[PDB]
């Protein structure tokens, strides 16, 4: 057993059970209350995920988080994904810059050693509001800061709430985003190896050309 794994009732058996990969303990406290007990499980991932591009499998498994991810599911780092405890893996991290642009693509890189979960659509991202604007009598949700800045001008007088992490949301909003999900089904392009090598790699000059355009 895994200490902080929260098992779904149908986990391991034949169902569409989804594993929720939060980026901390604080982001999963409300998950067990607002989830589908038969079909949802969770596991908190501590901090920034290991940069596992070009690493060996033995080096990969030396990380507690990656080892626990492989243990909770049926994923063997050198074998195919055939018999898994969870049908879907739903990465649901904090929507700020660190969670969305560092932990999420690194987790995608770690899951890229099984480039068939992506093809079958079993790798998902749970959209989470980074900005919650109290416009008049209604709450508007902005998932990325760029969207809010683009749409900030054409709104009436309001006050915004910045969602630093999923522990900043209330149970009503957590329940709304869990039982009424917005899923981004990640699909790997033909040249996914080049995009992963550029962002995750030894050469830092490849990130300078990319960042200058």
């Amino acid at each position: 057993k895994v200490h902080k794994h929260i098992k779904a009732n149908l986990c391991g058996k034949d169902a569409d059970t989804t594993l929720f990969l939060t980026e901390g303990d604080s982001a999963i406290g409300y998950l067990i209350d607002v989830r589908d007990k038969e079909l949802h499980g969770g596991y908190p991932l501590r901090g920034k995920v290991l940069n596992s591009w070009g690493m060996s499998y033995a080096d990969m498994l030396k990380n507690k988080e990656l080892f626990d991810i492989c243990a909770i599911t049926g994923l063997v780092l050198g074998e195919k994904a055939e018999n898994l405890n969870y049908h879907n893996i739903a990465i649901m991290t904090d929507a700020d810059h660190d969670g969305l642009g560092s932990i999420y693509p690194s987790l995608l890189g770690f899951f890229s050693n099984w480039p068939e979960l992506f093809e079958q659509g079993r790798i998902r991202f749970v959209k989470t509001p980074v900005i919650i604007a109290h416009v008049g009598k209604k709450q508007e949700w902005f998932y990325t800061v760029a969207e809010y800045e683009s749409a900030k001008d054409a709104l009436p007088k309001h006050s915004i709430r910045y969602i630093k992490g999923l522990g900043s949301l209330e149970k009503s909003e957590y329940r709304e985003m869990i039982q009424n999900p917005v899923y981004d089904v990640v699909k790997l392009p033909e040249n996914w190896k080049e995009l992963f090598e550029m962002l995750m790699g030894d050469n830092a000059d490849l990130r300078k050309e990319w960042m200058s355009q």
């Binding site: 098992k7 009732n9 604080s26 067990i32 007990k37 992490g165 522990g167």
Partner: protein, 441 residues
Amino acid sequence: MQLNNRDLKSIIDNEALAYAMYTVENRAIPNMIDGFKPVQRFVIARALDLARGNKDKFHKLASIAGGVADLGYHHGENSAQDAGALMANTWNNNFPLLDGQGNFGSRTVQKAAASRYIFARVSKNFYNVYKDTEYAPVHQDKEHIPPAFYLPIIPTVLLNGVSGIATGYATYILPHSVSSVKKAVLQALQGKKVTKPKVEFPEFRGEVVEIDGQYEIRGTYKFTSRTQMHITEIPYKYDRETYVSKILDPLENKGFITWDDACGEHGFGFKVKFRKEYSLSDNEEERHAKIMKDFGLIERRSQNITVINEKGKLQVYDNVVDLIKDFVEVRKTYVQKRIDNKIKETESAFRLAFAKAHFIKKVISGEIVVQGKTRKELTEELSKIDMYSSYVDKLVGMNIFHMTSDEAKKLAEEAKAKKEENEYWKTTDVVTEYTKDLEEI
């Protein structure tokens, strides 16, 4: 370099004794009146200072904990953060004194998120119950910015439940229903037979039975079939992880049960299927006892009502009724103090308003012109008049428009209104004011 002999007896009788008495009177035993440990008093005083401007603004718990050191807090700010996170939830308090924004924990996970995520503000319960903050006692420590204790109208120490451990002493008070405490306070204030308040646990759908002083907190189970059973409630002390690891897990590896989670929006709930190895008796009474004992569905709790009274010393109460009576007797004195202070303040305000109105009426139509003179000699000339005496810096500090028709009458009407307020405050008594305050709830 100085070398002085110091026997261990002196060390134990001075420094160790000081630390023990500090842990008792200033760390872990709550005050009887407001029900605050000193850290909670600091947290709520800082939250009040933060909410001075806008009362509906949510402030980060880190922001609240940072400023308590300037109010007289002498410890780490993580203790203040943890104390604040335990005061702003609706699963552990019957009468929360802070609203929280974010993940402050639940009955399943009794652990709030990190203080970098969650915000807090002073609750409407605090404003509804805690009255006469301006008349609260002044702490003997000049560096203690918050008062010695706040002045609520009902005993909050009985509402949320206190558990504290000190050196040599410990306190454990169970939470009580707000309605029963208010009714008991009303009965004590009116001079009646005080009915013992009922013990109520927040977000609890089970039973609480008082037997021989002990309190039995009982969960609920039902039987869907011969071998299937649904647990609808568990005793208040348990978590999801704690109950699973202590009861539900050391029953499946023993080959007795197979359990599934059903902890829906209602709260705690499980579905247990009984294997053939685990056998139940024919009759319902022994089977009920065995089931309710094996699954840990009974929690037995005793009450150790140890509180710091209004004199700062320790006090142990046999029950809750005596505590309520003592609290009411203490609070009536502060209601009387409020009445006296408001009488004096209304008298002073009426005197000032009438003096200003007379000064205006003399300026527009009278010998006083405030032209062709100086400031110091005008002040002396005003100080000549007995009525204008003691108000010379507030009479010449009035604006020009106060000499207009629309603003000369307003001063006289304000003087009349303040006189009527002073007359109102000179006829009420402690009982009526306290009854009105209770009626506010």
